[PDB]
Amino acid sequence: DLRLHLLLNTSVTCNDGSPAGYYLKESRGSRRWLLFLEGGWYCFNRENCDSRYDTMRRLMSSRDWPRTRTGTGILSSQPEENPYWWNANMVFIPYCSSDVWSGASSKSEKNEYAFMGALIIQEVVRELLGRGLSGAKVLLLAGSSAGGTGVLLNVDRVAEQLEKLGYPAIQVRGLADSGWFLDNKQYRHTCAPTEAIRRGIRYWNGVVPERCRRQFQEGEEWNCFFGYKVYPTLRSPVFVVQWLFDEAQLTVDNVHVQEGLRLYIQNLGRELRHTLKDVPASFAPACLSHEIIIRSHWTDVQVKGTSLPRALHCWDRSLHPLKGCPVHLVDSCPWPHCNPSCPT
Numbered sequence: 001d002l003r004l005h006l007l008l009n010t011s012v013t014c015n016d017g018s019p020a021g022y023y024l025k026e027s028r029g030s031r032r033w034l035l036f037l038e039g040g041w042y043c044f045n046r047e048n049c050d051s052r053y054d055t056m057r058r059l060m061s062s063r064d065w066p067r068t069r070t071g072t073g074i075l076s077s078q079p080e081e082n083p084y085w086w087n088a089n090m091v092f093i094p095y096c097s098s099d100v101w102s103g104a105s106s107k108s109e110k111n112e113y114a115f116m117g118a119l120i121i122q123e124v125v126r127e128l129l130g131r132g133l134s135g136a137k138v139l140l141l142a143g144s145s146a147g148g149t150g151v152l153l154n155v156d157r158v159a160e161q162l163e164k165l166g167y168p169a170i171q172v173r174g175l176a177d178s179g180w181f182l183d184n185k186q187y188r189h190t191c192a193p194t195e196a197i198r199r200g201i202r203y204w205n206g207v208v209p210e211r212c213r214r215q216f217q218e219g220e221e222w223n224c225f226f227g228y229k230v231y232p233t234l235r236s237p238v239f240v241v242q243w244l245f246d247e248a249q250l251t252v253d254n255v256h257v258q259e260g261l262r263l264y265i266q267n268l269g270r271e272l273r274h275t276l277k278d279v280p281a282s283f284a285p286a287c288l289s290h291e292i293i294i295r296s297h298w299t300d301v302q303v304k305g306t307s308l309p310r311a312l313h314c315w316d317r318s319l320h321p322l323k324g325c326p327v328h329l330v331d332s333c334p335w336p337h338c339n340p341s342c343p344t
């Protein structure tokens with residue numbers, strides 16, 4: 001089990017002003033640290049945040065969090081469930097800021113809610129340095145869904161934070177799961193993440209990585225929430241995990257089979273595959289699904305005969321091509337479940 005620690009700096013808060021926090025299981029002797037960002041959509045104005053507070057309150061508040069959590073998948077400490085990093089120090093950071101991990105705004109008289117996702121990450125890192133992170137060799141910032149996008153937005157800032165604090169020997173890396181989205185046309189028109197993120201950035205006081213911000217400039221920072229645009233600006237090594245037919249992508253595209261829809265789905269998979277062509281560390285199976293890395297059966301899916309835990313181990317070796325140890329694994333078949341190992 002991982003044990004809850006509420007942040008000692010109680011000014012770094014969840015949406016409702018309760019303290020943010022993290023769950024920790026230490027592994028004495030290991031100098032590897034895994035910090036995982038939870039996902040769960042977002043909210044972008046008073047009315048849709050009020051609805052989320054009524055029926056999704058654990059994503060906006062720490063008042064009801066349990067004292068412990070069980071680590072699963074890549075957060076498991078059992079080698080049978082986690083062949084990759086079972087002996088690492090494990091950290092689960094709950095998503096309670098509703099801002100894709102981008103916000104830097106406190107609650108006040110002008111603000112009903114606080115949006116502090118980017119500051120939550122920075123404060124967790126600061127407080128862990130006194131609990132053993134100061135001796136680390138590798139810090140892997142991982143995350144799923146909105147948390148995967150959060151990795152892309154924050155990995156280089158964590159690297160800069162550790163450098164400025166005097167820890168240049170900690171190698172910061174990213175693992176973005178199910179957070180690589182396309183700003184494409186909907187199958188039927190119905191809002192869209194581009195517009196919601198444009199509004200959210202203003203509502204949250206949201207921040208993006210510096211080099212990407214300098215490319216797109218004022219009013220266009222929403223572009224940096226899209227993996228294929230922000231990834232080439234990043235300096236830290238980042239491994240990208242993405243289903244070719246991701247369920248959250250299809251939801252925003254208003255897809256729920258005749259020729260028009262068949263062509264739409266085939267084109268989506270081809271576009272996603274194109275965006276990953278020049279991403280050297282990637283795992284992209286041809287499945288209709290959502291998230292993978294903290295699921296207990298994450299070991300089961302394979303691309304070209306290689307599992308995700310194996311690909312991640314090969315990535316570690318590459319950062320010390322390798323014979324029989326590949327790191328770029330993207331399916332070429334064009335329809336969901338053309339890969340027989342897709343989740344049932």
Ligand SMILES: O=C(O)CCSc1ncnc2ccccc12
Binds near residue numbers: 039040100181248249
């Ligand atoms: O968090 C989750 O469970 C999945 C929904 S997140 C998401 N879905 C669709 N498009 C996006 C575009 C930018 C950032 C986040 C998203």
Ligand SMILES: *[C@@H]1O[C@H](CO)[C@@H](O)[C@H](O)[C@H]1NC(C)=O
Binds near residue numbers: 009012
């Ligand atoms: C607490 O966090 C806030 C927001 O990040 C920061 O401005 C402040 O300096 C922090 N104070 C301490 C003592 O860590």
